[PDB]
Design a protein around this ligand. Structure first.
Ligand SMILES: CC(C)(C)c1cc(NC(=O)Nc2cccc3ccccc23)n(-c2cccc(N)c2)n1
Ligand SMILES: CCCCCCCCO[C@@H]1O[C@H](CO)[C@@H](O)[C@H](O)[C@H]1O
Length: 330
């Protein structure tokens, strides 16, 4: 059990092993950049906010720890360490997560075509991985991407520039059991914005968002209406003045023709029709980066716990177990 030291950093207390030095806020759970003396690398350390205050909090704490413990891929955030200042379960009331620091987010950054190719490539690559484990990200947007000065990119999730602008229309719509494909919609939104420097859909609310969305992709067609269960959704949509799908080549003029082609395949209204991460990787746009033998899938991820209703002390204790059983990577 390492030796700990405590500190105040903007109202919050931090009690971290001595191996981590030069703590310095980055954003607020609270996150701090630090120097990891054991490995020579700058890190990010996230102190979970009130991890066991309710059943919701406690389950969310367990959810993120379990998940981050499973993520082992270059384009997805991983765990360098997890620790608590607690010497037993009774004492356990604080969780800290450690990861490789990256320079900035993609919100902080119009780019060259070679840059978007590499950036979107890596997003699709981590997403292929995440999707193979049956995880949907749900909240992909430029600030959920960490990018370094080498342009190396990791997918993460702060849970805090409006989420809704990147959000798939079906979610704007409280659709039941939507799928992985919601993330590909997000990636197309992101890719567009890197190509143009402009938010593709800067909607002022959920209704505006869809109005802006339909204006580009057009109103749902016969085949898509067949699949709408909701009668009020259906009447409303068919009562709308119909738009045809714009020509993306006219919308994204001067963009690599292959970039435009890919956007057409991502930014489809019917989510069964969207290209997948696996498929997209093989698209001609990523010719200079694609390598089928280095685009790995995840070990299976069991999230059956999601359907369990447990007591705060049961989530806490499960989390405790996951802290204790943690094996640092090489
Ligand atoms: C889907 C995916 C990309 C693997 C993911 C990642 C996260 N959590 C994080 O990215 N957490 C972190 C964000 C920012 C800085 C961190 C620093 C150290 C450890 C985690 C961090 N996720 C997450 C899961 C559950 C709840 C929350 N809030 C976030 N989810
Ligand atoms: C103007 C609003 C149009 C929204 C239509 C979005 C279509 C979403 O696409 C739908 O996704 C569902 C959830 O994954 C699937 O079950 C359906 O098969 C698929 O058609």
């Amino acid at each position: 059990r390492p030796t700990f030291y405590r500190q105040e950093l903007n109202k919050t207390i931090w009690e971290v092993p001595e191996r981590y030095q030069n703590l310095s806020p980055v954003g607020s759970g609270s996150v701090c950049a630090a120097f990891d003396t054991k490995t020579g690398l700058r890190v990010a350390v996230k102190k979970l906010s009130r991890p066991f205050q309710s059943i919701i909090h406690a389950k969310r704490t367990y959810r993120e720890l379990r998940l981050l413990k499973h993520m082992k891929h270059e384009n997805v955030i991983g765990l360098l360490d997890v620790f608590t200042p607690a010497r037993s379960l009774e004492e356990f009331n604080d969780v800290y997560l450690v990861t490789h620091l990256m320079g900035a987010d993609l919100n902080n950054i119009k780019l060259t075509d070679d840059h978007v190719q590499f950036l979107i490539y890596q997003i699709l690559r981590g997403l292929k991985y995440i999707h193979s484990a049956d995880i949907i990200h749900r909240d992909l947007k430029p600030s959920n991407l960490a990018v370094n000065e080498d342009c190396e990119l990791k997918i993460l999730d702060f849970g805090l520039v409006a989420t809704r602008w990147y959000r798939a229309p079906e979610i704007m719509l409280n659709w039941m059991h939507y799928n992985q494909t919601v993330d590909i919609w997000s990636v197309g939104c992101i890719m567009a914005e890197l190509l143009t420097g402009r938010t593709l859909f800067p909607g002022t609310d959920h209704i505006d968002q869809l109005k802006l969305i339909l204006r580009l992709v057009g109103t749902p067609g016969a085949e898509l209406l067949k699949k709408i269960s909701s009668e009020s959704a259906r009447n409303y949509i068919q009562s709308l003045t119909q738009m045809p799908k714009m020509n993306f080549a006219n919308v994204f003029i001067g963009a690599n023709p292959l970039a435009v082609d890919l956007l057409e395949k991502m930014l489809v209204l019917d989510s069964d029709k969207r290209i997948t991460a696996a498929q997209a990787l093989a698209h001609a746009y990523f010719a200079q980066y694609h390598d089928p033998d280095d685009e790995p899938v995840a070990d299976p991820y069991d999230q059956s716990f999601e359907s369990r209703d447990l007591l705060i002390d049961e989530w806490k204790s499960l989390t405790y177990d996951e802290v204790i059983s943690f094996v640092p990577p090489p």
